[PDB]
Copies of this chain bind each other. A is one copy, B any other.
Amino acid sequence: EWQENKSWNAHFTEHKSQGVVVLWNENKQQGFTNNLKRANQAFLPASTFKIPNSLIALDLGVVKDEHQVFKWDGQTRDIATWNRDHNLITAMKYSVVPVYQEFARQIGEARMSKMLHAFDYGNEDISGNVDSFWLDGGIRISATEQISFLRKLYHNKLHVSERSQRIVKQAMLTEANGDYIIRAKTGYSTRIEPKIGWWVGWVELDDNVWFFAMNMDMPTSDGLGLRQAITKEVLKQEKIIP
């Protein structure tokens, strides 16, 4: 029973941007967004695909656990954080695309396809390079679809092991304190227009959970930090966090 809140567009305009924030009050089974149409527009997921990709790689044993080390391949890349060994925890934290490309190759085109259909993940289309389709292939997901997928991950309802889902939700840990916990993943789609930034995840309160998915136009990397700052202004506006 979705509800539209145009007040929120203020946060996008003040930041010289356009985008959508979608929230879901789990207790009340009630959704809210600034833009019902853009909430259902599907885009490339970019690094937010590291959630289902990690889930699949764990459940198939391509990743043994959150401690297994995947060493640098020696090629210097532009993001310096990528030029070191990683585990699942730090691979996610620094969005190490190459580590997840290796996972995608080992998972294989056919297993990737079956699992994403099992998840009902976006348009379930992995057309393109096995190792790049979430950046420049056929897969597409909307903010509302992000929420639906996230709600199943949260409740361990996806068709992978419970252990797989616990580990990935651990790896998503972004922020925690005495008022709330945030489990989430950023994304930045640049290879295919329109270039957009994503932030999807949820906020755990003592007595409720609030899922969120936001994307926003992002022509230049200068505004990447607005992904989180706008979402948090909306969460503050709505009294979800202090």
Residues on A facing B (Cβ under 8 Å): 89-90, 93, 162-163, 166-167, 170, 173-178, 181, 204, 206-207
Contacts and interface: CB of A to CB of B under 8 A. Distances in A.
Among A162, A175, A176, A207, the most chain B Cβ lie within 10 Å of the Cβ of A176
Chain A binding surface SS class = mixed
Contacts of A89: 204, 206
**Taking the full assembly, how many copies of this chain does it contain?**
2
Contacts of A176: 173-177, 181
A86 to B, nearest CB: 9
Nearest to A181: B173
Given A93-B206, A163-B166, A166-B166, A175 B173 contact: no
A50 B211 CA distance: 29
Given A174-B176, A176-B177, 14 more contacts: A89-B204, A89-B206, A90-B206, A90-B207, A93-B178, A93-B206, A163-B163, A163-B166, A166-B166, A173-B173, A173-B176, A173-B181, A175-B176, A176-B176
A174 B175 CA distance: 10
